[PDB]
Structure formats: C-alpha cells, structure tokens
Amino acid sequence: QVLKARIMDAAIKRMKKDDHRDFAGELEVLCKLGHHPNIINLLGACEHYLAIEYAPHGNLLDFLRKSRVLETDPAFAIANSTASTLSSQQLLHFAADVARGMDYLSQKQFIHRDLAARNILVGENYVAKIADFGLMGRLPVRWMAIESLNYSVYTTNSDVWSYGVLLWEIVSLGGTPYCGMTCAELYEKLPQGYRLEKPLNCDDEVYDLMRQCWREKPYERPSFAQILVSLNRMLEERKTYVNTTLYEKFTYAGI
Ligand SMILES: Cc1ccc(NC(=O)c2cccc(C(F)(F)F)c2)cc1Nc1ncccc1-c1ccncn1
C-alpha cells in the first residue's frame, strides 16, 4: 500500500476496522514525534494515506548487506582488498545517527519497542533515520531485552538492549544475530548470561559498548546520550574501529 510520490519527493502509505485504529494511532504518534534529522519526516495525512519523506537508499539492513562487496562484486573487492563499500567511519556514523535520533526520542518519553537495522532508513546524504514498519507477526525475539521477553516490560533501557543488537548488526554488516541458534535456545541461554560474540572485525571498544547495552540489570545500561558521545569519540579519533580490509581467511558473519 506504500507508493512513491511528489506529495517534495516522498513515500505514501495508502490505507482504505483494526487498521483504522492503527492508522489513527500511527499518525497521532508521528505528529507527537516532532522533527529531527535522524527520525522519519512525515509530510502529512490526507483524505481522498500517510506520507513521509522518501528514503532513496532503503532500510539499513539491506544497505549493510549490499555493502558486502566480496559477494556483490569480488573483482572489485579483491582488487581493492576491501570487504565492504562502507568504511568504519561510515558504519560508526550510521550508529551515531541512530543513537542521536533515539536520544531525541527517549527524551520525549518515547519508547520504540522495535529498534533494529530493518527498521532504520538510509536517506538523503546517507543520514540514518529511525522508523517503524511494523511487526503471524511473531515477536522480534533476537532483539528483545530479557525483561521484554519474560514480562513484556518495554522502556528506554530495553530500547538500548535492542540498540546494542543493532550496533552488532552494523559492525557485522547486517549479519543475523545468534546465527544458527534457535529462538527458544535464547530464552534459555540469555538468562544464563549468554551474549553475542565479539565480531572478528571489531575493536574491543565497540564490543564493550555493545556489552553495556545488554546488561541484565536494566538500570545499568548506558543512556542513548552516553552512546552518542562514546561513538562520537571513536569517529573523532584517527584509529580505525571496524576492520573492513580483506585478508586470506576472511569471512562474513552469517545471514
Ligand atoms: C509510508 C510510511 C508511513 C509511516 C511510517 N511510519 C514509521 O516508520 C513510524 C511509525 C511509528 C513510530 C515511528 C518512530 F518513532 F520510530 F519514528 C515511525 C513509515 C512509512 N514508510 C515505509 N513503510 C513501509 C515500507 C517502506 C517505507 C518507506 C520506504 C522508503 N522511504 C520511506 N518509507
């Protein structure tokens, strides 16, 4: 029901019940969100469909995967000895973008509940933008905090847990988290302290920021501002944090 248009350049969701409360909901929601360069921009609703500025680069998940140059075009990759058309600084920027937008939202008592690369858009100038396309409609178990899984507790602290997973997806260049692990295998091991592993191409400092996000105690996780700031510090240094160069035994995090 989504269609491109010049309503400026944008995207509209055509809606003709339950869908009426969601539609009356989503708009009410987007109105309250305000405007920030790291969250979607709604141009308006009309009666004749909800429209927001269009994102020419799609969702971040797909973007990260097309970035897998060794798969998309090996001649170029090998020749240039690189694993992705995206650099560490660009990856960290997408991460800083989401943390920035999320900080603008959390400050407004807005709980996202479904942060994930799939729900992020890559728009004009490659500015990551927080969005929400919707959830059979099973729950996003791989991205949920332990407390969301067991008691349906949703907060900025649980949005941070999902964020940490998203950061992992970023570094992984879009790999599925808990690759080859059962959704139920998680309800078990997660409470036992199990966590995603440090991606091979990842500097310990990024991994540390990821661990902070998934701490069992909801109140011990960093705020979205402490994340923006720490990421900003990494973007600021000369040091490279996400290895993207190619090497003999190189391999991509699974999908
Ligand atoms: C067409 C359309 C209408 C409305 C929203 N809304 C959200 O996200 C949203 C809802 C509630 C809360 C938030 C949050 F706070 F997170 F910001 C965001 C997204 C899309 N866009 C859309 N929907 C489905 C498939 C593709 C696209 C799409 C493609 C390209 N560019 C822009 N949009």
mmCIF file of C-alpha atoms and ligand atoms in Angstrom:
data_model
loop_
_atom_site.group_PDB
_atom_site.id
_atom_site.type_symbol
_atom_site.label_atom_id
_atom_site.label_comp_id
_atom_site.label_asym_id
_atom_site.label_seq_id
_atom_site.Cartn_x
_atom_site.Cartn_y
_atom_site.Cartn_z
ATOM 1 C CA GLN A 1 0.000 0.000 0.000
ATOM 2 C CA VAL A 2 3.118 2.194 0.032
ATOM 3 C CA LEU A 3 3.680 4.304 -3.073
ATOM 4 C CA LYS A 4 6.267 6.834 -4.257
ATOM 5 C CA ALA A 5 5.148 10.387 -4.995
ATOM 6 C CA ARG A 6 5.968 14.081 -5.172
ATOM 7 C CA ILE A 7 3.424 14.944 -2.470
ATOM 8 C CA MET A 8 8.524 17.256 -2.445
ATOM 9 C CA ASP A 9 9.855 13.732 -3.020
ATOM 10 C CA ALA A 10 8.230 11.267 -0.614
ATOM 11 C CA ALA A 11 6.545 7.936 0.156
ATOM 12 C CA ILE A 12 2.863 7.459 0.961
ATOM 13 C CA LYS A 13 1.071 4.593 2.671
ATOM 14 C CA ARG A 14 -2.371 4.089 1.146
ATOM 15 C CA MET A 15 -4.982 2.903 3.625
ATOM 16 C CA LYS A 16 -8.694 2.456 2.833
ATOM 17 C CA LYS A 17 -11.514 -1.794 11.377
ATOM 18 C CA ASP A 18 -8.352 -2.712 13.281
ATOM 19 C CA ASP A 19 -6.298 -0.924 10.612
ATOM 20 C CA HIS A 20 -8.318 2.223 11.314
ATOM 21 C CA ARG A 21 -7.163 2.393 14.954
ATOM 22 C CA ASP A 22 -3.557 1.694 13.916
ATOM 23 C CA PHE A 23 -3.827 4.392 11.249
ATOM 24 C CA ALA A 24 -5.482 6.813 13.676
ATOM 25 C CA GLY A 25 -2.712 5.699 16.002
ATOM 26 C CA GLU A 26 0.389 5.918 13.817
ATOM 27 C CA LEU A 27 -0.498 9.445 12.676
ATOM 28 C CA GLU A 28 -1.212 10.597 16.222
ATOM 29 C CA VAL A 29 2.194 9.132 17.001
ATOM 30 C CA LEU A 30 4.158 10.696 14.137
ATOM 31 C CA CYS A 31 2.614 14.085 14.964
ATOM 32 C CA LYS A 32 3.911 13.881 18.554
ATOM 33 C CA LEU A 33 7.428 12.861 17.461
ATOM 34 C CA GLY A 34 8.171 16.303 16.061
ATOM 35 C CA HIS A 35 11.064 16.672 13.645
ATOM 36 C CA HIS A 36 14.758 15.707 13.812
ATOM 37 C CA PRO A 37 17.201 14.705 11.034
ATOM 38 C CA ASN A 38 17.601 11.205 12.485
ATOM 39 C CA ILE A 39 13.916 10.137 12.662
ATOM 40 C CA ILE A 40 11.476 9.875 9.741
ATOM 41 C CA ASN A 41 9.837 13.053 8.485
ATOM 42 C CA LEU A 42 6.083 12.891 7.951
ATOM 43 C CA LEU A 43 4.765 15.314 5.344
ATOM 44 C CA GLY A 44 1.162 14.697 6.297
ATOM 45 C CA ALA A 45 -2.059 12.724 6.047
ATOM 46 C CA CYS A 46 -4.836 13.254 3.510
ATOM 47 C CA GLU A 47 -8.441 12.285 2.773
ATOM 48 C CA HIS A 48 -9.289 11.204 -0.790
ATOM 49 C CA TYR A 49 -2.816 7.604 3.092
ATOM 50 C CA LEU A 50 0.089 8.672 5.344
ATOM 51 C CA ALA A 51 3.121 10.265 3.696
ATOM 52 C CA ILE A 52 6.694 10.828 4.900
ATOM 53 C CA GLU A 53 9.834 11.996 3.085
ATOM 54 C CA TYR A 54 11.228 9.260 0.835
ATOM 55 C CA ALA A 55 14.450 7.404 1.568
ATOM 56 C CA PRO A 56 16.280 6.643 -1.717
ATOM 57 C CA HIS A 57 18.613 4.111 -0.059
ATOM 58 C CA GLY A 58 16.180 1.720 1.612
ATOM 59 C CA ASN A 59 16.400 0.166 5.066
ATOM 60 C CA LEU A 60 19.776 -0.092 6.765
ATOM 61 C CA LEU A 61 19.715 -3.888 6.925
ATOM 62 C CA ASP A 62 19.562 -4.293 3.163
ATOM 63 C CA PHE A 63 22.047 -1.422 2.765
ATOM 64 C CA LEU A 64 24.613 -3.109 5.002
ATOM 65 C CA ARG A 65 24.290 -6.365 3.045
ATOM 66 C CA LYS A 66 24.633 -4.862 -0.446
ATOM 67 C CA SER A 67 27.758 -3.367 1.108
ATOM 68 C CA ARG A 68 29.178 -6.894 1.230
ATOM 69 C CA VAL A 69 31.416 -6.226 -1.722
ATOM 70 C CA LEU A 70 33.147 -9.624 -1.628
ATOM 71 C CA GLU A 71 29.739 -11.090 -2.516
ATOM 72 C CA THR A 72 28.299 -8.327 -4.726
ATOM 73 C CA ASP A 73 31.453 -7.863 -6.869
ATOM 74 C CA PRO A 74 34.623 -9.844 -5.943
ATOM 75 C CA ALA A 75 36.751 -8.488 -8.778
ATOM 76 C CA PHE A 76 36.447 -5.013 -7.245
ATOM 77 C CA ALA A 77 36.751 -6.273 -3.681
ATOM 78 C CA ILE A 78 39.824 -8.394 -4.240
ATOM 79 C CA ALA A 79 41.407 -5.731 -6.445
ATOM 80 C CA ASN A 80 40.863 -3.127 -3.741
ATOM 81 C CA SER A 81 41.415 -5.552 -0.846
ATOM 82 C CA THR A 82 38.188 -4.470 0.872
ATOM 83 C CA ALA A 83 35.224 -6.339 2.335
ATOM 84 C CA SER A 84 32.581 -3.623 2.036
ATOM 85 C CA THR A 85 31.798 -0.449 0.109
ATOM 86 C CA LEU A 86 31.223 1.099 3.544
ATOM 87 C CA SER A 87 34.040 2.244 5.820
ATOM 88 C CA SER A 88 34.478 2.093 9.585
ATOM 89 C CA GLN A 89 33.795 5.825 9.853
ATOM 90 C CA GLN A 90 30.607 5.465 7.777
ATOM 91 C CA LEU A 91 29.457 2.490 9.856
ATOM 92 C CA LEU A 92 30.085 4.360 13.085
ATOM 93 C CA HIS A 93 28.231 7.365 11.602
ATOM 94 C CA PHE A 94 25.103 5.280 10.936
ATOM 95 C CA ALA A 95 25.451 4.123 14.552
ATOM 96 C CA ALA A 96 25.902 7.644 15.880
ATOM 97 C CA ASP A 97 22.884 8.744 13.786
ATOM 98 C CA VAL A 98 20.546 6.194 15.399
ATOM 99 C CA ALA A 99 21.841 6.937 18.877
ATOM 100 C CA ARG A 100 21.291 10.645 18.147
ATOM 101 C CA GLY A 101 17.721 10.159 16.941
ATOM 102 C CA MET A 102 16.926 7.750 19.753
ATOM 103 C CA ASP A 103 18.228 10.305 22.266
ATOM 104 C CA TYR A 104 15.856 12.897 20.801
ATOM 105 C CA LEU A 105 13.025 10.373 21.180
ATOM 106 C CA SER A 106 13.757 8.932 24.626
ATOM 107 C CA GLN A 107 13.958 12.487 25.998
ATOM 108 C CA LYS A 108 10.296 12.734 24.930
ATOM 109 C CA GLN A 109 9.406 9.589 26.870
ATOM 110 C CA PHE A 110 9.050 7.771 23.555
ATOM 111 C CA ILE A 111 9.747 4.071 23.763
ATOM 112 C CA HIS A 112 10.420 2.494 20.398
ATOM 113 C CA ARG A 113 9.964 -1.214 21.270
ATOM 114 C CA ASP A 114 11.375 -2.456 17.956
ATOM 115 C CA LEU A 115 14.840 -0.989 17.246
ATOM 116 C CA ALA A 116 16.609 -2.982 14.533
ATOM 117 C CA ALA A 117 18.535 -2.380 11.319
ATOM 118 C CA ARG A 118 15.431 -3.459 9.360
ATOM 119 C CA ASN A 119 13.528 -0.575 10.953
ATOM 120 C CA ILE A 120 16.111 2.119 10.124
ATOM 121 C CA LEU A 121 16.113 4.081 6.870
ATOM 122 C CA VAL A 122 19.101 5.407 4.938
ATOM 123 C CA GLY A 123 18.044 8.761 3.484
ATOM 124 C CA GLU A 124 19.320 11.852 1.690
ATOM 125 C CA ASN A 125 23.065 12.361 2.232
ATOM 126 C CA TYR A 126 23.109 8.905 3.826
ATOM 127 C CA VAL A 127 21.575 10.114 7.076
ATOM 128 C CA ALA A 128 20.278 7.136 9.047
ATOM 129 C CA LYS A 129 16.688 7.623 10.128
ATOM 130 C CA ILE A 130 14.759 5.871 12.862
ATOM 131 C CA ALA A 131 11.495 4.369 11.559
ATOM 132 C CA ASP A 132 8.994 1.587 12.310
ATOM 133 C CA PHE A 133 7.399 -0.534 9.576
ATOM 134 C CA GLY A 134 5.564 -2.947 11.881
ATOM 135 C CA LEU A 135 5.896 -6.463 13.316
ATOM 136 C CA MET A 136 1.687 -14.345 12.253
ATOM 137 C CA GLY A 137 3.570 -11.208 13.282
ATOM 138 C CA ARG A 138 5.904 -13.028 15.661
ATOM 139 C CA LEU A 139 7.936 -11.083 18.217
ATOM 140 C CA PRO A 140 11.466 -9.817 17.374
ATOM 141 C CA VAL A 141 12.940 -12.166 19.961
ATOM 142 C CA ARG A 142 16.562 -11.829 18.791
ATOM 143 C CA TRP A 143 16.395 -8.070 19.527
ATOM 144 C CA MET A 144 14.387 -8.117 22.784
ATOM 145 C CA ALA A 145 15.826 -7.469 26.242
ATOM 146 C CA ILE A 146 15.488 -10.388 28.662
ATOM 147 C CA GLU A 147 12.839 -8.448 30.618
ATOM 148 C CA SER A 148 10.816 -7.752 27.467
ATOM 149 C CA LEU A 149 10.834 -11.467 26.664
ATOM 150 C CA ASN A 150 9.654 -12.551 30.108
ATOM 151 C CA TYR A 151 7.338 -9.755 31.301
ATOM 152 C CA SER A 152 6.600 -7.535 28.337
ATOM 153 C CA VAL A 153 8.460 -4.712 30.049
ATOM 154 C CA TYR A 154 9.357 -2.061 27.455
ATOM 155 C CA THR A 155 11.470 1.030 28.331
ATOM 156 C CA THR A 156 14.304 3.202 27.102
ATOM 157 C CA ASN A 157 16.581 0.679 28.809
ATOM 158 C CA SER A 158 15.107 -2.127 26.718
ATOM 159 C CA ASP A 159 15.299 0.071 23.596
ATOM 160 C CA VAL A 160 19.009 0.270 24.461
ATOM 161 C CA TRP A 161 19.263 -3.525 24.540
ATOM 162 C CA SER A 162 17.835 -3.686 21.030
ATOM 163 C CA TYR A 163 20.188 -0.832 20.013
ATOM 164 C CA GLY A 164 23.159 -2.864 21.154
ATOM 165 C CA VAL A 165 21.971 -5.645 18.864
ATOM 166 C CA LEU A 166 21.591 -3.154 16.011
ATOM 167 C CA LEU A 167 25.118 -1.888 16.617
ATOM 168 C CA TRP A 168 26.211 -5.525 16.315
ATOM 169 C CA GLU A 169 24.336 -5.814 13.037
ATOM 170 C CA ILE A 170 26.123 -2.657 11.845
ATOM 171 C CA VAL A 171 29.592 -3.968 12.665
ATOM 172 C CA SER A 172 28.564 -7.369 11.245
ATOM 173 C CA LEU A 173 27.461 -5.587 8.095
ATOM 174 C CA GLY A 174 23.944 -6.958 8.537
ATOM 175 C CA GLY A 175 24.537 -10.441 9.890
ATOM 176 C CA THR A 176 21.610 -12.150 11.613
ATOM 177 C CA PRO A 177 22.258 -12.126 15.370
ATOM 178 C CA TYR A 178 22.596 -15.555 17.044
ATOM 179 C CA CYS A 179 23.177 -17.112 13.641
ATOM 180 C CA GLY A 180 22.104 -20.746 13.690
ATOM 181 C CA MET A 181 20.701 -20.535 17.192
ATOM 182 C CA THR A 182 17.074 -21.361 17.997
ATOM 183 C CA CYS A 183 14.643 -18.678 19.090
ATOM 184 C CA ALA A 184 13.884 -20.911 22.077
ATOM 185 C CA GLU A 185 17.577 -21.645 22.627
ATOM 186 C CA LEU A 186 17.710 -17.977 23.612
ATOM 187 C CA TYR A 187 15.005 -17.886 26.291
ATOM 188 C CA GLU A 188 17.279 -20.376 27.985
ATOM 189 C CA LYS A 189 20.860 -19.222 27.477
ATOM 190 C CA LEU A 190 20.162 -15.472 27.590
ATOM 191 C CA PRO A 191 19.099 -15.503 31.266
ATOM 192 C CA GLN A 192 22.244 -17.565 31.854
ATOM 193 C CA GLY A 193 24.412 -14.646 30.768
ATOM 194 C CA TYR A 194 24.858 -15.749 27.162
ATOM 195 C CA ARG A 195 25.524 -12.871 24.748
ATOM 196 C CA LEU A 196 26.511 -12.368 21.125
ATOM 197 C CA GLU A 197 30.219 -12.831 20.470
ATOM 198 C CA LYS A 198 32.729 -10.131 19.591
ATOM 199 C CA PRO A 199 32.644 -9.795 15.794
ATOM 200 C CA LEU A 200 36.044 -10.625 14.276
ATOM 201 C CA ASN A 201 36.395 -7.250 12.521
ATOM 202 C CA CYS A 202 35.543 -5.406 15.720
ATOM 203 C CA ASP A 203 37.659 -3.235 18.034
ATOM 204 C CA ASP A 204 37.168 -4.110 21.720
ATOM 205 C CA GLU A 205 35.866 -0.627 22.448
ATOM 206 C CA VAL A 206 32.871 -1.072 20.143
ATOM 207 C CA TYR A 207 32.251 -4.509 21.567
ATOM 208 C CA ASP A 208 32.393 -3.028 25.045
ATOM 209 C CA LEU A 209 29.733 -0.504 24.105
ATOM 210 C CA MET A 210 27.629 -3.461 22.868
ATOM 211 C CA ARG A 211 28.027 -5.358 26.146
ATOM 212 C CA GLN A 212 26.975 -2.304 28.135
ATOM 213 C CA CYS A 213 23.733 -2.326 26.167
ATOM 214 C CA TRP A 214 22.887 -5.922 27.028
ATOM 215 C CA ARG A 215 23.448 -5.879 30.781
ATOM 216 C CA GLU A 216 20.900 -7.940 32.705
ATOM 217 C CA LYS A 217 20.154 -5.066 35.091
ATOM 218 C CA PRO A 218 18.067 -2.571 33.024
ATOM 219 C CA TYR A 219 19.297 0.388 35.053
ATOM 220 C CA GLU A 220 22.998 -0.385 34.398
ATOM 221 C CA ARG A 221 22.814 0.098 30.640
ATOM 222 C CA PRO A 222 24.125 3.404 29.245
ATOM 223 C CA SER A 223 21.781 6.143 28.095
ATOM 224 C CA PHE A 224 21.439 6.944 24.417
ATOM 225 C CA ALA A 225 23.411 10.141 25.057
ATOM 226 C CA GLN A 226 26.361 8.269 26.598
ATOM 227 C CA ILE A 227 26.299 6.122 23.481
ATOM 228 C CA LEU A 228 26.216 9.089 21.078
ATOM 229 C CA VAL A 229 29.143 10.641 22.940
ATOM 230 C CA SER A 230 31.250 7.477 23.047
ATOM 231 C CA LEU A 231 30.601 6.804 19.370
ATOM 232 C CA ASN A 232 31.419 10.433 18.608
ATOM 233 C CA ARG A 233 34.745 9.961 20.409
ATOM 234 C CA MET A 234 35.540 6.993 18.165
ATOM 235 C CA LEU A 235 34.521 8.855 15.000
ATOM 236 C CA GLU A 236 36.790 11.628 16.266
ATOM 237 C CA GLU A 237 39.997 9.593 16.617
ATOM 238 C CA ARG A 238 42.308 8.553 13.797
ATOM 239 C CA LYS A 239 42.177 4.929 14.914
ATOM 240 C CA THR A 240 40.038 2.529 12.862
ATOM 241 C CA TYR A 241 37.445 0.579 14.843
ATOM 242 C CA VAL A 242 35.688 -1.600 12.290
ATOM 243 C CA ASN A 243 38.107 -3.591 10.164
ATOM 244 C CA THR A 244 36.893 -3.777 6.574
ATOM 245 C CA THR A 245 40.065 -4.757 4.723
ATOM 246 C CA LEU A 246 40.343 -8.214 3.134
ATOM 247 C CA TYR A 247 42.651 -10.993 4.309
ATOM 248 C CA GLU A 248 43.311 -14.642 3.385
ATOM 249 C CA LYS A 249 40.894 -16.353 5.787
ATOM 250 C CA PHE A 250 38.334 -13.535 5.847
ATOM 251 C CA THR A 251 34.673 -14.444 6.188
ATOM 252 C CA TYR A 252 31.336 -12.677 6.678
ATOM 253 C CA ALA A 253 29.121 -13.004 9.732
ATOM 254 C CA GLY A 254 26.353 -15.359 8.586
ATOM 255 C CA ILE A 255 22.906 -14.477 7.299
HETATM 256 C C1 LIG B 1 4.894 5.016 4.240
HETATM 257 C C2 LIG B 1 5.185 5.155 5.664
HETATM 258 C C3 LIG B 1 4.217 5.730 6.615
HETATM 259 C C4 LIG B 1 4.519 5.810 8.057
HETATM 260 C C5 LIG B 1 5.798 5.304 8.566
HETATM 261 N N1 LIG B 1 5.992 5.367 9.951
HETATM 262 C C6 LIG B 1 7.029 4.906 10.697
HETATM 263 O O1 LIG B 1 8.074 4.408 10.280
HETATM 264 C C7 LIG B 1 6.833 5.056 12.133
HETATM 265 C C8 LIG B 1 5.599 4.713 12.851
HETATM 266 C C9 LIG B 1 5.555 4.899 14.302
HETATM 267 C C10 LIG B 1 6.736 5.409 15.028
HETATM 268 C C11 LIG B 1 7.982 5.749 14.301
HETATM 269 C C12 LIG B 1 9.270 6.235 15.007
HETATM 270 F F1 LIG B 1 9.104 6.802 16.197
HETATM 271 F F2 LIG B 1 10.074 5.166 15.146
HETATM 272 F F3 LIG B 1 9.885 7.161 14.299
HETATM 273 C C13 LIG B 1 7.994 5.568 12.837
HETATM 274 C C14 LIG B 1 6.778 4.736 7.621
HETATM 275 C C15 LIG B 1 6.486 4.668 6.163
HETATM 276 N N2 LIG B 1 7.452 4.187 5.233
HETATM 277 C C16 LIG B 1 7.558 2.876 4.712
HETATM 278 N N3 LIG B 1 6.712 1.863 5.199
HETATM 279 C C17 LIG B 1 6.703 0.523 4.775
HETATM 280 C C18 LIG B 1 7.639 0.109 3.739
HETATM 281 C C19 LIG B 1 8.519 1.154 3.226
HETATM 282 C C20 LIG B 1 8.541 2.559 3.661
HETATM 283 C C21 LIG B 1 9.487 3.622 3.089
HETATM 284 C C22 LIG B 1 10.438 3.343 2.040
HETATM 285 C C23 LIG B 1 11.300 4.418 1.685
HETATM 286 N N4 LIG B 1 11.232 5.646 2.295
HETATM 287 C C24 LIG B 1 10.340 5.959 3.296
HETATM 288 N N5 LIG B 1 9.494 4.944 3.667
#
